[PDB]
Design a binder for this molecule. Structure first.
Ligand SMILES: Cc1cn([C@H]2C[C@H](N=[N+]=[N-])[C@@H](CO)O2)c(=O)[nH]c1=O
Ligand SMILES: Cc1cn([C@H]2C[C@H](N=[N+]=[N-])[C@@H](CO)O2)c(=O)[nH]c1=O
Lengths: 184, 186
Protein backbone atom coordinates (compact mmCIF):
# COMPACT_ATOMS: atom_id res chain seq x y z
CA UNK A 1 0.00 0.00 0.00
CA UNK A 2 2.98 2.43 0.31
CA UNK A 3 4.46 3.80 -2.91
CA UNK A 4 7.39 1.75 -4.25
CA UNK A 5 6.79 -1.03 -1.72
CA UNK A 6 8.20 -4.32 -2.97
CA UNK A 7 10.03 -2.64 -5.89
CA UNK A 8 13.50 -2.20 -4.39
CA UNK A 9 16.55 -4.45 -4.00
CA UNK A 10 18.88 -4.59 -1.00
CA UNK A 11 19.85 -0.95 -0.44
CA UNK A 12 23.01 0.50 1.06
CA UNK A 13 23.27 4.08 2.24
CA UNK A 14 26.66 5.75 2.30
CA UNK A 15 26.50 8.37 5.04
CA UNK A 16 29.21 10.72 6.34
CA UNK A 17 30.22 14.32 7.01
CA UNK A 18 31.22 16.69 4.20
CA UNK A 19 34.68 15.48 3.11
CA UNK A 20 34.48 12.06 4.72
CA UNK A 21 35.51 10.52 1.37
CA UNK A 22 32.01 9.49 0.19
CA UNK A 23 32.57 10.10 -3.54
CA UNK A 24 35.84 8.14 -3.44
CA UNK A 25 34.09 5.32 -1.63
CA UNK A 26 31.25 5.08 -4.15
CA UNK A 27 33.68 5.06 -7.07
CA UNK A 28 35.24 1.79 -5.91
CA UNK A 29 31.94 0.19 -6.99
CA UNK A 30 31.96 1.73 -10.50
CA UNK A 31 33.54 -1.32 -12.10
CA UNK A 32 30.38 -3.12 -11.07
CA UNK A 33 28.09 -0.67 -12.85
CA UNK A 34 26.40 -3.67 -14.49
CA UNK A 35 25.32 -5.46 -11.31
CA UNK A 36 24.99 -2.57 -8.83
CA UNK A 37 22.71 0.49 -9.01
CA UNK A 38 24.86 3.51 -8.09
CA UNK A 39 23.22 6.82 -7.26
CA UNK A 40 25.40 9.74 -6.22
CA UNK A 41 23.92 12.60 -4.18
CA UNK A 42 21.74 14.63 -6.63
CA UNK A 43 23.74 17.89 -6.32
CA UNK A 44 23.44 18.35 -10.09
CA UNK A 45 19.68 18.46 -9.77
CA UNK A 46 20.00 20.97 -6.90
CA UNK A 47 22.26 23.12 -9.11
CA UNK A 48 19.70 23.22 -11.88
CA UNK A 49 15.95 23.28 -11.12
CA UNK A 50 14.63 24.19 -14.56
CA UNK A 51 17.48 26.73 -14.74
CA UNK A 52 17.46 27.90 -11.13
CA UNK A 53 20.55 27.11 -9.03
CA UNK A 54 19.09 26.41 -5.59
CA UNK A 55 22.46 25.49 -4.11
CA UNK A 56 24.08 28.94 -4.78
CA UNK A 57 20.93 30.78 -3.69
CA UNK A 58 21.00 28.92 -0.39
CA UNK A 59 24.61 29.86 0.29
CA UNK A 60 23.80 33.44 -0.81
CA UNK A 61 20.79 33.95 1.58
CA UNK A 62 19.94 30.96 3.86
CA UNK A 63 17.07 32.62 5.80
CA UNK A 64 15.11 32.94 2.54
CA UNK A 65 16.20 29.87 0.51
CA UNK A 66 16.94 27.08 3.06
CA UNK A 67 13.27 26.02 3.12
CA UNK A 68 12.82 25.59 -0.64
CA UNK A 69 16.30 24.08 -0.93
CA UNK A 70 15.75 21.41 1.77
CA UNK A 71 12.25 20.78 0.48
CA UNK A 72 13.79 20.12 -2.94
CA UNK A 73 16.62 17.98 -1.50
CA UNK A 74 13.95 15.90 0.21
CA UNK A 75 12.21 15.41 -3.10
CA UNK A 76 15.38 14.36 -4.94
CA UNK A 77 16.15 11.87 -2.22
CA UNK A 78 12.72 10.32 -2.68
CA UNK A 79 13.33 10.26 -6.41
CA UNK A 80 16.49 8.24 -5.85
CA UNK A 81 14.95 6.16 -3.07
CA UNK A 82 11.99 5.11 -5.25
CA UNK A 83 13.67 4.91 -8.66
CA UNK A 84 13.10 1.52 -10.23
CA UNK A 85 15.98 -0.86 -11.06
CA UNK A 86 16.40 -4.46 -12.14
CA UNK A 87 19.75 -4.77 -10.31
CA UNK A 88 19.98 -6.96 -7.20
CA UNK A 89 21.86 -4.36 -5.13
CA UNK A 90 21.60 -0.59 -4.85
CA UNK A 91 23.85 1.96 -3.20
CA UNK A 92 23.02 5.63 -2.52
CA UNK A 93 25.29 8.49 -1.48
CA UNK A 94 23.33 10.11 1.36
CA UNK A 95 19.57 9.77 1.80
CA UNK A 96 16.36 11.34 3.01
CA UNK A 97 17.55 10.45 6.51
CA UNK A 98 20.78 12.48 6.45
CA UNK A 99 18.83 15.38 4.94
CA UNK A 100 16.31 15.30 7.78
CA UNK A 101 18.39 14.36 10.83
CA UNK A 102 21.59 16.16 9.91
CA UNK A 103 21.15 19.05 7.50
CA UNK A 104 17.60 20.22 8.32
CA UNK A 105 18.09 19.72 12.05
CA UNK A 106 21.28 21.70 11.93
CA UNK A 107 19.59 24.57 10.06
CA UNK A 108 16.99 24.71 12.81
CA UNK A 109 19.71 24.97 15.49
CA UNK A 110 21.53 27.82 13.77
CA UNK A 111 18.20 29.48 12.83
CA UNK A 112 18.53 29.32 9.04
CA UNK A 113 15.13 27.60 9.26
CA UNK A 114 12.66 29.59 11.36
CA UNK A 115 10.08 27.68 13.42
CA UNK A 116 7.34 27.68 10.73
CA UNK A 117 9.69 26.49 8.02
CA UNK A 118 11.21 23.71 10.07
CA UNK A 119 7.70 22.47 11.02
CA UNK A 120 6.47 22.35 7.43
CA UNK A 121 9.40 20.15 6.48
CA UNK A 122 8.81 17.96 9.56
CA UNK A 123 5.15 17.48 8.77
CA UNK A 124 6.18 16.41 5.28
CA UNK A 125 8.80 13.99 6.74
CA UNK A 126 6.05 12.37 8.81
CA UNK A 127 3.67 12.13 5.84
CA UNK A 128 6.46 10.69 3.74
CA UNK A 129 6.94 7.78 6.17
CA UNK A 130 3.23 6.94 6.05
CA UNK A 131 3.00 7.10 2.29
CA UNK A 132 6.34 6.38 0.64
CA UNK A 133 8.52 3.27 1.06
CA UNK A 134 12.18 4.14 1.77
CA UNK A 135 14.25 0.98 1.30
CA UNK A 136 17.22 1.02 3.65
CA UNK A 137 19.02 -2.23 4.65
CA UNK A 138 22.49 -1.09 5.64
CA UNK A 139 24.06 2.28 6.35
CA UNK A 140 27.81 2.55 5.88
CA UNK A 141 29.04 5.35 8.11
CA UNK A 142 32.32 6.89 6.93
CA UNK A 143 33.10 8.25 10.36
CA UNK A 144 35.76 10.98 10.52
CA UNK A 145 36.94 13.79 12.71
CA UNK A 146 35.79 17.34 11.84
CA UNK A 147 39.45 18.43 11.63
CA UNK A 148 40.42 15.67 9.17
CA UNK A 149 37.34 16.48 7.13
CA UNK A 150 38.51 20.08 7.27
CA UNK A 151 41.85 19.28 5.50
CA UNK A 152 39.86 18.20 2.41
CA UNK A 153 36.01 25.61 2.16
CA UNK A 154 33.10 25.25 4.60
CA UNK A 155 33.84 26.57 8.10
CA UNK A 156 35.10 24.11 10.74
CA UNK A 157 32.32 24.89 13.26
CA UNK A 158 29.76 23.74 10.66
CA UNK A 159 31.60 20.43 10.22
CA UNK A 160 31.60 19.90 14.00
CA UNK A 161 27.84 20.56 14.21
CA UNK A 162 27.22 18.14 11.36
CA UNK A 163 29.61 15.63 12.97
CA UNK A 164 27.67 15.65 16.25
CA UNK A 165 24.40 15.17 14.37
CA UNK A 166 25.76 12.17 12.42
CA UNK A 167 27.15 10.84 15.72
CA UNK A 168 23.76 11.26 17.47
CA UNK A 169 21.85 9.59 14.63
CA UNK A 170 24.22 6.69 13.86
CA UNK A 171 26.23 5.83 17.03
CA UNK A 172 24.20 6.92 20.05
CA UNK A 173 14.94 5.63 15.61
CA UNK A 174 15.72 3.17 12.75
CA UNK A 175 16.59 -0.51 13.47
CA UNK A 176 18.55 -0.50 10.16
CA UNK A 177 22.06 -1.96 10.58
CA UNK A 178 24.99 0.53 10.72
CA UNK A 179 28.59 -0.15 9.72
CA UNK A 180 31.18 2.24 11.09
CA UNK A 181 34.39 2.79 9.10
CA UNK A 182 37.37 4.86 10.18
CA UNK A 183 37.85 7.29 7.31
CA UNK A 184 40.78 9.08 9.02
CA UNK B 1 1.19 0.65 -6.41
CA UNK B 2 0.30 4.31 -5.63
CA UNK B 3 -0.38 5.23 -2.00
CA UNK B 4 -4.07 5.14 -1.07
CA UNK B 5 -4.99 3.43 -4.35
CA UNK B 6 -8.24 1.48 -3.99
CA UNK B 7 -8.92 2.96 -0.54
CA UNK B 8 -11.30 5.81 -1.47
CA UNK B 9 -15.03 6.09 -2.19
CA UNK B 10 -16.64 8.27 -4.85
CA UNK B 11 -15.17 11.73 -4.19
CA UNK B 12 -16.64 15.16 -4.89
CA UNK B 13 -14.53 18.31 -4.92
CA UNK B 14 -16.23 21.64 -4.11
CA UNK B 15 -14.28 24.27 -6.00
CA UNK B 16 -14.85 28.04 -6.20
CA UNK B 17 -13.38 31.50 -5.68
CA UNK B 18 -13.04 33.01 -2.21
CA UNK B 19 -16.61 33.88 -1.20
CA UNK B 20 -18.34 31.68 -3.74
CA UNK B 21 -20.45 30.18 -0.96
CA UNK B 22 -18.42 27.00 -0.49
CA UNK B 23 -18.92 26.67 3.28
CA UNK B 24 -22.67 27.22 2.93
CA UNK B 25 -22.83 24.60 0.21
CA UNK B 26 -20.97 21.96 2.24
CA UNK B 27 -23.21 22.56 5.27
CA UNK B 28 -26.28 21.40 3.34
CA UNK B 29 -24.71 17.93 3.57
CA UNK B 30 -24.09 18.02 7.35
CA UNK B 31 -27.41 16.29 8.13
CA UNK B 32 -25.90 13.32 6.27
CA UNK B 33 -22.80 13.22 8.50
CA UNK B 34 -23.45 9.50 8.97
CA UNK B 35 -23.36 8.51 5.30
CA UNK B 36 -21.08 11.15 3.75
CA UNK B 37 -17.48 11.98 4.62
CA UNK B 38 -17.26 15.78 4.88
CA UNK B 39 -13.87 17.48 4.84
CA UNK B 40 -13.70 21.26 5.00
CA UNK B 41 -10.61 23.12 3.79
CA UNK B 42 -7.92 22.58 6.45
CA UNK B 43 -7.55 26.29 7.37
CA UNK B 44 -7.40 25.30 11.02
CA UNK B 45 -4.28 23.27 10.35
CA UNK B 46 -2.73 26.19 8.43
CA UNK B 47 -3.46 28.48 11.39
CA UNK B 48 -1.63 26.19 13.81
CA UNK B 49 1.43 24.22 12.70
CA UNK B 50 2.65 23.05 16.08
CA UNK B 51 1.87 26.56 17.27
CA UNK B 52 3.01 28.51 14.24
CA UNK B 53 0.32 30.44 12.34
CA UNK B 54 1.39 30.03 8.73
CA UNK B 55 -1.69 31.78 7.33
CA UNK B 56 -0.96 35.03 9.18
CA UNK B 57 2.77 34.98 8.38
CA UNK B 58 1.93 34.59 4.70
CA UNK B 59 -0.30 37.64 4.63
CA UNK B 60 2.34 39.73 6.43
CA UNK B 61 5.34 38.74 4.28
CA UNK B 62 4.40 36.70 1.15
CA UNK B 63 7.88 36.83 -0.46
CA UNK B 64 9.27 34.90 2.52
CA UNK B 65 6.38 32.69 3.65
CA UNK B 66 4.44 31.81 0.47
CA UNK B 67 6.68 28.83 -0.27
CA UNK B 68 6.38 27.13 3.13
CA UNK B 69 2.66 27.99 3.29
CA UNK B 70 1.80 26.49 -0.13
CA UNK B 71 4.06 23.55 0.61
CA UNK B 72 2.08 22.99 3.78
CA UNK B 73 -1.27 23.50 2.02
CA UNK B 74 -0.32 20.82 -0.47
CA UNK B 75 0.43 18.48 2.43
CA UNK B 76 -2.86 19.08 4.19
CA UNK B 77 -4.63 18.52 0.90
CA UNK B 78 -2.93 15.14 0.57
CA UNK B 79 -3.84 14.33 4.12
CA UNK B 80 -7.52 14.91 3.31
CA UNK B 81 -7.28 13.26 -0.11
CA UNK B 82 -5.76 10.10 1.38
CA UNK B 83 -7.60 9.94 4.71
CA UNK B 84 -9.34 6.60 5.13
CA UNK B 85 -13.12 6.32 5.52
CA UNK B 86 -15.75 3.61 5.51
CA UNK B 87 -18.36 5.96 3.99
CA UNK B 88 -19.59 5.35 0.45
CA UNK B 89 -19.35 9.02 -0.57
CA UNK B 90 -16.80 11.76 0.25
CA UNK B 91 -16.87 15.49 -0.31
CA UNK B 92 -13.90 17.89 0.06
CA UNK B 93 -13.87 21.71 0.14
CA UNK B 94 -11.06 22.53 -2.29
CA UNK B 95 -8.23 20.18 -3.19
CA UNK B 96 -4.62 19.75 -4.21
CA UNK B 97 -5.78 20.85 -7.68
CA UNK B 98 -7.11 24.29 -6.71
CA UNK B 99 -4.01 24.89 -4.59
CA UNK B 100 -1.72 24.07 -7.56
CA UNK B 101 -3.61 25.55 -10.54
CA UNK B 102 -5.11 28.59 -8.86
CA UNK B 103 -3.30 29.69 -5.70
CA UNK B 104 0.26 28.69 -6.48
CA UNK B 105 -0.01 29.69 -10.13
CA UNK B 106 -1.34 33.08 -9.10
CA UNK B 107 1.49 33.63 -6.62
CA UNK B 108 3.93 32.98 -9.45
CA UNK B 109 2.22 35.58 -11.68
CA UNK B 110 2.31 38.28 -8.97
CA UNK B 111 5.83 37.26 -7.93
CA UNK B 112 5.08 36.15 -4.37
CA UNK B 113 6.77 32.91 -5.44
CA UNK B 114 10.13 33.54 -7.07
CA UNK B 115 11.19 31.16 -9.86
CA UNK B 116 13.14 28.78 -7.57
CA UNK B 117 10.28 28.46 -5.15
CA UNK B 118 7.60 27.90 -7.76
CA UNK B 119 9.77 25.20 -9.39
CA UNK B 120 10.30 23.30 -6.12
CA UNK B 121 6.54 23.12 -5.60
CA UNK B 122 5.99 22.07 -9.25
CA UNK B 123 8.55 19.29 -8.99
CA UNK B 124 6.69 18.10 -5.88
CA UNK B 125 3.34 18.28 -7.74
CA UNK B 126 4.80 16.05 -10.44
CA UNK B 127 6.20 13.56 -7.94
CA UNK B 128 2.89 13.57 -6.13
CA UNK B 129 1.00 12.37 -9.23
CA UNK B 130 3.45 9.50 -9.71
CA UNK B 131 3.31 8.36 -6.13
CA UNK B 132 0.05 9.36 -4.48
CA UNK B 133 -3.50 8.48 -5.57
CA UNK B 134 -5.78 11.52 -5.60
CA UNK B 135 -9.39 10.33 -5.84
CA UNK B 136 -11.46 12.86 -7.80
CA UNK B 137 -14.73 11.79 -9.51
CA UNK B 138 -16.67 15.04 -9.78
CA UNK B 139 -15.83 18.70 -9.32
CA UNK B 140 -18.68 20.99 -8.34
CA UNK B 141 -17.72 24.50 -9.52
CA UNK B 142 -19.52 27.24 -7.60
CA UNK B 143 -19.02 29.77 -10.38
CA UNK B 144 -19.45 33.42 -9.42
CA UNK B 145 -18.42 36.88 -10.57
CA UNK B 146 -15.48 38.55 -8.83
CA UNK B 147 -17.75 41.46 -7.96
CA UNK B 148 -20.42 39.28 -6.30
CA UNK B 149 -17.70 37.41 -4.44
CA UNK B 150 -16.13 40.70 -3.38
CA UNK B 151 -19.58 41.69 -2.13
CA UNK B 152 -20.42 38.45 -0.34
CA UNK B 153 -17.07 38.73 1.53
CA UNK B 154 -17.18 42.52 2.26
CA UNK B 155 -20.65 41.93 3.85
CA UNK B 156 -19.39 38.93 5.92
CA UNK B 157 -11.28 41.48 3.02
CA UNK B 158 -9.44 40.35 -0.14
CA UNK B 159 -8.76 43.07 -2.74
CA UNK B 160 -10.96 42.81 -5.87
CA UNK B 161 -8.05 42.46 -8.32
CA UNK B 162 -6.97 39.29 -6.45
CA UNK B 163 -10.44 37.78 -6.77
CA UNK B 164 -10.35 38.54 -10.54
CA UNK B 165 -6.98 36.83 -10.94
CA UNK B 166 -8.25 33.82 -9.01
CA UNK B 167 -11.48 33.85 -11.03
CA UNK B 168 -9.61 33.68 -14.35
CA UNK B 169 -7.52 30.81 -13.06
CA UNK B 170 -10.58 28.81 -11.94
CA UNK B 171 -12.16 29.66 -15.31
CA UNK B 172 -9.08 28.45 -17.23
CA UNK B 173 -8.85 25.22 -15.21
CA UNK B 174 -12.53 24.25 -15.07
CA UNK B 175 -14.28 25.76 -18.13
CA UNK B 176 -11.74 26.27 -20.92
CA UNK B 177 -10.57 22.63 -20.48
CA UNK B 178 -12.77 14.44 -14.30
CA UNK B 179 -16.40 15.61 -14.74
CA UNK B 180 -17.16 19.24 -13.83
CA UNK B 181 -20.51 20.61 -12.72
CA UNK B 182 -20.98 24.36 -13.02
CA UNK B 183 -23.43 26.08 -10.68
CA UNK B 184 -24.43 29.74 -10.79
CA UNK B 185 -23.62 31.00 -7.31
CA UNK B 186 -24.68 34.60 -8.08
C1 LIG C 1 22.10 16.18 1.60
C2 LIG C 1 22.28 17.65 1.85
C3 LIG C 1 23.40 18.34 1.38
N1 LIG C 1 23.53 19.65 1.64
C4 LIG C 1 24.69 20.44 1.15
C5 LIG C 1 26.04 20.22 1.83
C6 LIG C 1 27.05 20.25 0.69
N2 LIG C 1 27.81 21.46 0.64
N3 LIG C 1 28.93 21.74 0.16
N4 LIG C 1 29.91 21.97 -0.25
C7 LIG C 1 26.27 20.27 -0.61
C8 LIG C 1 26.68 19.05 -1.43
O1 LIG C 1 26.68 17.91 -0.55
O2 LIG C 1 24.89 20.23 -0.26
C9 LIG C 1 22.50 20.32 2.35
O3 LIG C 1 22.61 21.55 2.58
N5 LIG C 1 21.40 19.70 2.80
C10 LIG C 1 21.22 18.39 2.60
O4 LIG C 1 20.19 17.81 3.01
C1 LIG D 1 -6.24 26.44 -0.80
C2 LIG D 1 -5.44 27.69 -0.56
C3 LIG D 1 -5.95 28.76 0.17
N1 LIG D 1 -5.21 29.86 0.35
C4 LIG D 1 -5.70 31.03 1.13
C5 LIG D 1 -6.77 31.91 0.50
C6 LIG D 1 -7.71 32.25 1.65
N2 LIG D 1 -7.56 33.59 2.13
N3 LIG D 1 -8.34 34.36 2.73
N4 LIG D 1 -9.01 35.04 3.26
C7 LIG D 1 -7.30 31.41 2.84
C8 LIG D 1 -8.49 30.54 3.26
O1 LIG D 1 -9.05 29.97 2.07
O2 LIG D 1 -6.20 30.61 2.41
C9 LIG D 1 -3.89 29.90 -0.18
O3 LIG D 1 -3.18 30.92 -0.01
N5 LIG D 1 -3.36 28.88 -0.87
C10 LIG D 1 -4.05 27.77 -1.10
O4 LIG D 1 -3.54 26.82 -1.74
Amino acid sequence: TKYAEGTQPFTVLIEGNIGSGKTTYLNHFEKYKNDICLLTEPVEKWRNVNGVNLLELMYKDPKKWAMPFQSYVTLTMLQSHTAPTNKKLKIMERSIFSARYCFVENMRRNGSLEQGMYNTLEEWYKFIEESIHVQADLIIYLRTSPEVAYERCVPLKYLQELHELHEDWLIHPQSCKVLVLDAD
